[PDB]
Amino acid sequence: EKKTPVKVYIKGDLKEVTFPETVQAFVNKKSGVLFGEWSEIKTILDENSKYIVDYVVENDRRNSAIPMLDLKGIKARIEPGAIIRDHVEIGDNAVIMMNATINIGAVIGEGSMIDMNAVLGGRATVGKNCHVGAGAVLAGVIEPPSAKPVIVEDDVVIGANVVVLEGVTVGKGAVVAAGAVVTEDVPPYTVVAGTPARVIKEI
Amino acid sequence: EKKTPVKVYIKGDLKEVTFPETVQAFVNKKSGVLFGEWSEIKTILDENSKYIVDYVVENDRRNSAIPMLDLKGIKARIEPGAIIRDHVEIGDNAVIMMNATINIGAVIGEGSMIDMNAVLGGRATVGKNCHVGAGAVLAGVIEPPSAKPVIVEDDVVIGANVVVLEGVTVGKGAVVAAGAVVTEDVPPYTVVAGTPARVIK
Amino acid sequence: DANEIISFIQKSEKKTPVKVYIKGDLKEVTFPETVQAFVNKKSGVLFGEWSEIKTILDENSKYIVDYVVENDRRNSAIPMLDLKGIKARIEPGAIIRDHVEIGDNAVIMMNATINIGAVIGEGSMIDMNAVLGGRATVGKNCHVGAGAVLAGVIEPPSAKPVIVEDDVVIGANVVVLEGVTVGKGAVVAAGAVVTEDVPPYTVVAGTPARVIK
Ligand SMILES: [Ca+2]
Ligand SMILES: [Ca+2]
Ligand SMILES: [Ca+2]
Ligand SMILES: [Ca+2]
Numbered sequence A: 001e002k003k004t005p006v007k008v009y010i011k012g013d014l015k016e017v018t019f020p021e022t023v024q025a026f027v028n029k030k031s032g033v034l035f036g037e038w039s040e041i042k043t044i045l046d047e048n049s050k051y052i053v054d055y056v057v058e059n060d061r062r063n064s065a066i067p068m069l070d071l072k073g074i075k076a077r078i079e080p081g082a083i084i085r086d087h088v089e090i091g092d093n094a095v096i097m098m099n100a101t102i103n104i105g106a107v108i109g110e111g112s113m114i115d116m117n118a119v120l121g122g123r124a125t126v127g128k129n130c131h132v133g134a135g136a137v138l139a140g141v142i143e144p145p146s147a148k149p150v151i152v153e154d155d156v157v158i159g160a161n162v163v164v165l166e167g168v169t170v171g172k173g174a175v176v177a178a179g180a181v182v183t184e185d186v187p188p189y190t191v192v193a194g195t196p197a198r199v200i201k202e203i
Numbered sequence B: 001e002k003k004t005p006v007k008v009y010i011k012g013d014l015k016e017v018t019f020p021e022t023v024q025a026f027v028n029k030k031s032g033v034l035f036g037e038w039s040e041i042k043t044i045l046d047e048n049s050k051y052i053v054d055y056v057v058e059n060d061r062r063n064s065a066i067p068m069l070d071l072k073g074i075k076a077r078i079e080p081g082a083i084i085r086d087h088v089e090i091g092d093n094a095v096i097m098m099n100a101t102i103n104i105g106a107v108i109g110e111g112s113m114i115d116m117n118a119v120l121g122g123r124a125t126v127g128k129n130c131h132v133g134a135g136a137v138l139a140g141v142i143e144p145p146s147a148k149p150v151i152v153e154d155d156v157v158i159g160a161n162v163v164v165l166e167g168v169t170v171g172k173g174a175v176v177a178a179g180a181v182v183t184e185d186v187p188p189y190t191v192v193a194g195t196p197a198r199v200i201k
Numbered sequence C: 001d002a003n004e005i006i007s008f009i010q011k012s013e014k015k016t017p018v019k020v021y022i023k024g025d026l027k028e029v030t031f032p033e034t035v036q037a038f039v040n041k042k043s044g045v046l047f048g049e050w051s052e053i054k055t056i057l058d059e060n061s062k063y064i065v066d067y068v069v070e071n072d073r074r075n076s077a078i079p080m081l082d083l084k085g086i087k088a089r090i091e092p093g094a095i096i097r098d099h100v101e102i103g104d105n106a107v108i109m110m111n112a113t114i115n116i117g118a119v120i121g122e123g124s125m126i127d128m129n130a131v132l133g134g135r136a137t138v139g140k141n142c143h144v145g146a147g148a149v150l151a152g153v154i155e156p157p158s159a160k161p162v163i164v165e166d167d168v169v170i171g172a173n174v175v176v177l178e179g180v181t182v183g184k185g186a187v188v189a190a191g192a193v194v195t196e197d198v199p200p201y202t203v204v205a206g207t208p209a210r211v212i213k
Helices: A038-047 B038-047 C002-011 C050-059
Strands: A005-012 A024-027 A031-037 A052-059 A190-194 A197-202 B005-012 B024-027 B031-037 B052-058 B191-193 C017-024 C036-039 C043-049 C064-071 C203-206 C209-211
Touching: A005 A038, A005 C036, A024 B005, A024 B031, A024 B052, A031 A038, A031 B031, A031 C036, A038 A052, A052 C036, B005 B038, B024 C017, B024 C043, B024 C064, B031 B038, B038 B052, C017 C050, C043 C050, C050 C064
Parallel strands: none
Antiparallel strands: A005 A031, A005 A052, A024 A031, A190 A197, B005 B031, B005 B052, B024 B031, C017 C043, C017 C064, C036 C043, C203 C209
């Protein structure tokens, strides 16, 4: 389940090397690229040192089990550097900015923005037309299914570097000031600020 | 123009496949790598499956319009994982650390450091010899061109996980305490701290 | 050790590595020793320094029909950590410099950033987008919350780094300032800025953090 996927560019007398079905070998007679588990590929490189004379190994993760979300057909905008796990629901015309991180089970509603370097923890739920500020953290609640995650209702603005703690609901149309730590449910149409966040105005 | 670029490693009887001008195909008879739009390349893979035996598709962005900054000739240091949009000015001898993010229109002065996981929003301006702390956020003001962005003057230290709000100027030589939220202009050569940030020293 | 870190950093030359996919009449091109060329007659890829490869592309323009240049860093001297043999879990997007110790069964989450000299103990979790500064030390069975920042120090070598002792929980978006020790079993509330040592088995909160329990 945990994997250490590598891509390996190779060159040499490749016709002399046979590759197992466990690895995807894209090669011609002298040069090629190999895709597979490092444990499998390492053995191949070692046992064929005579014919594979040079190689470059690329690797981006170690003992990782959860794949990344396939972005190619999503009806929304995902910028370079955003890391999104599989099993995340991205609503129509949402925007996921550079270097944001979104964990499994998260939901991002239609038209919502997750700004740069923001973090959505497991199952965090963001409604429609929300703005989750840069560096803001929505706590995760990976399991059980019955455990209330962070829920941000529609039309909410969450300030930069905010933290919303596990199981907290931010009510519709509310505003959370930058830097706040939200420890309790926020009533709809109110502005909260501080650590712990307190209501400072009714909208 | 929103794009969905892909890089596709491919193999098969590749001479039998004709690639359009829209696709850059670096291939030989047996194997190759294709660069282009997903819409374009998906069509090619499906229609030529008779000749394509296997492939691997890589993709890092979806419906993305703004390209990344070409770093190759910049007289500065940019570390792996830093994400910098095009139309950003990076001063001589600046340093951009791993996992920082710098949005369009930002300006970083000579000798300044943007630390790990810091965020410079749209049009945010940083002077010379500044240090923007890890995780600090300089709010963005993307438009209109007449809206004042965040302006950090020279010789400033911004603490880790600070937020400087839209349109605020942090004056020359000031220090902002870690975790502060700067909600109004900071006078030159003062220390501010707290949320909201208040003058201390 | 700290002296070794400083010496390593300065023995490393600044690099601008590229990967360049090329095609054309490549048999007419002689690639220099300084470049790794994985090529066939028709097409291939080149690994090397931009300054070296740019020269090649120019001087052989008549033989190179097209190319794509990839680059992810500029004037960068410290390489990334080889993850392939580490007995831990490191997720995509995590950026870890060489000369970092990752303890058995640790977890480094997506988009975390770990500077040179850092030490992460066994079974500890560094959560999403957290930052470990130079020489920052995290004990065993710790949890460093998402977005939390542990201060760094590289120079001088004698300077005290941030030390997180065992069994600690650091809340999300917390900042621990340089030289601070967070005591064994302590809990730091989300959003706190820790400005002085935290006694073991206490709870601290606020900015500046103060003992609450
Ligand atoms: Ca290797
Ligand atoms: Ca990243
Ligand atoms: Ca989580
Ligand atoms: Ca912005």
